[PDB]
């Protein structure tokens, strides 16, 4: 597509605790066939926190990873202090 | 862990349309102190769909790749012939 792939952006409760996926249909057909026919299928999921800094986008897996890139950052450093593992 | 990192297994609705992702509170409050400090935070998400075939765990993102892979294997061609593009 036109934009850039980075990859299904989710969409968050108010509460900001659960997001909710949907499945395309043709994919829960494959899963249910697979299951039927004893392939014990699953969907595998990975999620990365993406934001825009100075001017790029940065994504992070891992709170220390977030916490050592803040601390280079004046403009995070400390905004995160009390978020952040002190680690 | 001990268990191999596979990524996040999802646990599938009834109708298997859909399935509910539950995020860390502490990733919760990184996402609020970003999103009004207008970092614009956004989490992605990258799905796929893996299961046990001859004695290995094969991983798919697209139907033609699935459909290319299950055309080589008799256990598994005419069982999605009908599931799977005809491209």
Chains 1, 2 share one sequence.
């Not at 036109?2 to 499945?23: F, K, P």
């Not at 899963?31 to 790029?56: H, M, Q, S």
């Amino acid at each position: 597509g036109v934009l850039m792939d980075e990859g299904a952006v989710l969409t968050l409760a108010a509460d900001l605790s659960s997001a909710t996926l949907d499945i395309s249909k043709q994919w829960s057909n494959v899963f249910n066939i697979l299951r039927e026919n004893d392939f014990e299928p699953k969907f595998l999921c990975e999620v990365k926190l993406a934001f825009k800094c100075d001017g790029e986008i940065k994504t992070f897996s891992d709170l220390q990873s977030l916490r050592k890139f803040a601390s280079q950052k004046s403009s995070m450093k400390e905004l995160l202090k009390d978020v952040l593992p002190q680690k």
